[PDB]
């Protein structure tokens, strides 16, 4: 139950990711064999729930690609449920300040370090109590990644970076650019400046910066600035754009 | 992506609806061909979730009947998820005051007009970014309908009617009659008086009144008073009552 | 595990049925409480399979209405699977002659009386071996109903009626009328004469006649003539027609 | 719609239960025939939602074993949805004080006794309005069981026990032991003392004590102290441990 | 219910297709908007059944792309079920001779032209009897495409082409090359010669030639030679290859 | 894609199995971690289909336990579909003679060795063409196990054993005992003698004998006699019996 994604971030090894919004355990398996370091199962902007996350985790399990799950909100109940089906790395949207970052961390840890509810007999996470000393080992293998995606969050970044347990800070360019008045097109200089400055500042604190960006030149630029978990495409986009291009070539 | 239901309300064209509680994409398609102007996919009182709403929207799509979705609560996260799978007209239950009405409206609009989270690459709503300028066009095609269904809500109706974005106000007779002490039988004069007075007052403000009522004589009465979205039956009731009547005719 | 539908046929008590083509465990429960003697889960003309049959059987189980299942064909393998999930009354389509009727019967019976495969530990049918002596008790509680639906089958009816274990013979007016050259018009005199004559011949042979007909006056005629399992409507039709009529009353 | 589990608790008849975390309507039916007085469908620590609770309720319905449902949190919206699909006995986790206990009770009662939303036409709970006077009969057949599972909750137990509507108080040893510093192993004397003292105090108030414990000797000890709803095993554990033992016997 | 794909073939307008093996109603909708003339829902080599075909048909329905369905075999019972859920264009695998081609045709036609079972009240195909005179109109809108995939089938092609109701003949290069002794290598000259010769012979007979080929230059060659329904890619391949290429660009 | 189960049989290493009839990807994972050498996904006597087989294969994949799949019949089309979703070891029921054994083998092999249909781009089996030279490597990793379950099959055993590609012969005691006139009583001496003699004859022929038996002492006897794939229990039974025993210990 060692979290290899978390260890890679701590070691400063960049992790290249693909976003999964197709909400299918079948396409998840297909994509798990494609060579990515990590895969993001999106519970916020794709039609997923705890049950479909579970089946996508099962599909991905035998592959080297490591699963990361985004809940629909920073909700301790939903987080509890996602952890019990076996989620170990969480990307929490709309984290606005250090209190919310601490709340996210706490939701993933058993008492006394947090408020995670105990149900190990029932949980895939413990392999239904086959993992010895699961309750004592689980906290240290949780990896908490918080999203900053408003001006307010950017303003609070220094305090967020002081939060123990926050392993990574992810910048969401679509939401950020919308909040900045450039809906939701992040290519503007003002947005790019905020993004790049945040990446530097995050890495400086010893935490992992992350981002999703479909422009490959920008992705390489962010990696050069020290980003450590960079998602470089989205399954729905890859499929749609490839299919459209193919159809157009035949008139 | 023009919202034809919203345009019809704004033009003062009454829209006759059927409530869908069978929670099936198959019966939804069957009913989408029955001649109604709108269909209510009930996420509050039928066993639906974001995923079953999605499949019912797909089933209904090629028909003239327009889908409306009721979330289980005025919850901005659930609303975000329903909008991304393509919901454009929302019926929000238990809206008690103008602050809650504003919250409902805000949940459906991208910044700066609201707090809707941005995820268009992943969303059926944008057809996975095939709709050009989706982010700039979406806000104006959202139709927000708020339910008033307690004495408190009735008391706050004048302020609710002053809320920009609130396109329609729906009176829920079952909940209202229960709150008034007539569980949950709305046929009482006191309940009927509150309902009819609200319909007049709503229409007077330039907003659309709505209601669900299975009594067809009452439905016509509400239409005559100026109601513009009137659901006149419920799928589960139509099926159950027709089947029971049939069985009884054969002993 | 007594088959009460079968006992009722044997005692000459007419059983009034409803056809289920909505393929949903949810609407199946709703309809199971409507007062019918039997409900037909249609695996031939509705999108059902062994798994959805199972869930509909579970939904119907606590109600007095008895389930009957129609497989897609007289296929011993499919019949084996349906029986193991708990089907005890089968309506077999397109039975053309006595050999095929015999094969339908043999598919439902364990050796030496038939060729039913043994898997009792796994089967809902035996309640996972909780029913004592299931293997010795099962054969006698199977009820086999065969459909005669062509001119060839009508010719062979006397031989079909002589087959031991054929408990009932069902006339399919839609298929029969199509085979006779009157598609969509079983109301034609030559078709009605064939149907009436078959019903009388079936009953005079000491077996149960059955039919589906949505015209309530014809249903009553068939009951008078001695039909013992008569389906008097179809869920999809009841729902579609009630909905369409409702919408039409409002324009 | 009489709640027989609730009546048994009120009569002081101990009820022996099994926990269901397999989240399957198929295994639920299999286990419903095993002889337990009650079955716990776990929406907090197993991958269930309103829809899978519904199908497990349908599967269990014809058996003598009575269903109890645990929502993922004390959330009035989720409770509303669970009640409409037919839940009558609720086990509410993490109830910390008397205000939260009152909130749980209120969520299950129609006005004026509570805030339960009215949707009986659509609800399996009313059998789609077949149950006469459902709205007037429902409140009295709801059975509310609250979980105490922290030191804080134990401290507030006397006030919780004064709450009308609270029919039972369940002690959760896994969460309690974790909160007490013995994650999450409850066998410690300190934990056992808190548990046994609570059982006595609960029963003394005229309310039903409950607990889940897989150690059968402890279960008998709790029953001897006056516990009235005792779950004595968990489906996932029974299956896993039996399978592991079997494999080990063959090397 | 006009079959526009069939009318296009008859008019000699080439139709460009994409193969759907992702077996998801969600990705089917995404791809239905990509601009293809037709989409092949594969029931032979992807994990589909009648029920998933149904949901994909519903997803595709509002788009201009026309659905074609491949059953797992030339099986009249399976074909009956696919037609009733609304399939009008069928691609039948492993058609070896004229007798088998005739049987494929007869499976799609109501008596006296064929053996299609009648169940219109239940069928999406008739929109549950909403389409007037469905039974008299259906036969003419069925489009039957037969696959020639072996040396034996190539031999029998002239007789297959003489079968009335065979609208198109599709060459399966993967199966054909395997049968010829070049598995996985349809690029071999002897295979290409067989394919080209078949396409010309099919077209000269006044029928539509079809093929699937992922090599875009070969596709263009086949179109030049007169192929009228040409699938130019496969969803699983498009997705897998785009993802793998992306991951490789970042290491 | 090496078949380790097949290699183990060939090397004479006995493989201990558990039967899976719960038809759930969730319980399949739970059981995949219990330490068995193989797990039988039963498509004959449990409510499975190609799609649920797929999800169980995905669940089992990261564990050391090897999956074996039983189709509902010796049906080449069904076998094609099971192989494409990734099945490499097949247990074929009711194989009565050498011709049928040959047909089972041929269904699993690409031409010229067999009649397996080619669809590698679409198949999980080839990991969507990621496995290089899949088409040339697949045949050799198929493992075909045939069931002898009647007196006729026992007669033909010597000829069945002479069929190339038959890797193992499994004796089905429930079906065999029923065919011999001892339904539900394979413990009878004449049945045990037939079983023992078959096991010895199979092994002496250089092939693997198999059987399912829930009596652990008989299992050990069969292993001593040289059986190489022995299933020693069934998930539904393990669960039902453990639950019933538990409930009985409390009254
Ligand atoms: Co964002
Ligand atoms: Co209401
Ligand atoms: Co028929
Ligand atoms: Co707890
Ligand atoms: Co082919
Ligand atoms: Co057998």
Give the helices and strands, then pairings.
The structure is a homohexamer of 251-residue chains.
Chain A: H1 4-10, E1 15-20, H2 25-32, E2 38-42, H3 50-60, E3 66-70, H4 76-84, E4 89-92, H5 98-106, H6 134-137, E5 143-148, H7 151-155, H8 157-160, E6 166-171, H9 173-180, H10 189-204, E7 208-212, H11 216-224, E8 229-234, H12 235-248
Parallel strand pairs in A: 1-2, 1-8, 2-3, 4-5, 5-6, 6-7, 7-8
Helix pairs in contact in A: 2-3
The complex binds cobalt (II) ion (6 copies).
One cobalt (II) ion (CO) binds at residues 93, 149, 172, 174-175 of chain D.
Architecture overview:
The structure is a homohexamer of 251-residue chains. Chain A has 251 residues and is of the alpha/beta class. Chain A has one domain (1-251): TIM Barrel (Alpha-Beta Barrel). Helix content of chain A is 41%, strand content 17%. Chain A is built from 12 helices and 8 strands. Chain A has an 8-stranded parallel beta sheet, with helices on both faces. In chain A, strand 7, helix 11 (216-224) and strand 8 (229-234) form a beta-alpha-beta unit. In chain A, helix 2 packs parallel to helix 3. The N and C termini of chain A lie far apart (51 Å). The E-F interface holds E 19, 21, 23, 42, 44-47, 49, 52, 72-73, 75, 93-94, 174-175, 178-179, 181, 183-184, 214, 234, 236-237, 240 and F 49-51, 54, 77, 80-81, 84-85, 110-112, 117-123, 128-130, 133-136. One cobalt (II) ion (CO) binds next to helix 9 of chain B.
């Amino acid at each position: 139950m060692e979290n290899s994604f978390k260890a890679a971030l701590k070691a400063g090894r960049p992790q290249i990711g693909l976003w999964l919004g197709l909400s299918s355990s079948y396409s998840a398996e297909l994509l798990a064999g494609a060579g990515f370091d990590w895969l993001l199962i999106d519970g916020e902007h794709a039609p997923n729930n705890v049950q479909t996350v579970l089946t996508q985790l099962q599909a991905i399990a035998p592959y080297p690609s490591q699963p990361v799950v985004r809940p629909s909100w920073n909700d301790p109940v939903q987080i509890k449920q996602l952890l019990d089906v076996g989620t170990q790395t969480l990307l929490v949207p709309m984290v606005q300040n250090a209190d919310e970052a601490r709340e996210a961390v706490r939701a993933t840890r058993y008492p006394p370090a947090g408020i995670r509810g105990v149900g190990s007999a029932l949980a895939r996470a413990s392999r239904w109590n086959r993992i010895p000393d699961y309750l004592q080992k689980a906290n240290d293998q949780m990896c908490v990644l918080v999203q900053i995606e408003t001006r307010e969050a950017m303003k609070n970044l220094p305090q967020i970076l002081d939060v123990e347990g926050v392993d990574g800070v992810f910048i969401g360019p679509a939401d950020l650019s919308a909040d900045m008045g450039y809906a939701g097109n992040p290519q503007h200089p003002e947005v790019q400046a905020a993004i790049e400055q945040a990446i530097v500042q995050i890495r400086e604190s010893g935490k992992a910066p992350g981002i999703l960006i479909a422009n490959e030149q920008l992705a390489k630029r962010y990696l050069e600035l020290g980003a450590l978990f960079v998602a470089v495409g989205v399954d729905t986009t890859l499929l749609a754009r490839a299919a459209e291009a193919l159809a157009a070539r035949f008139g």
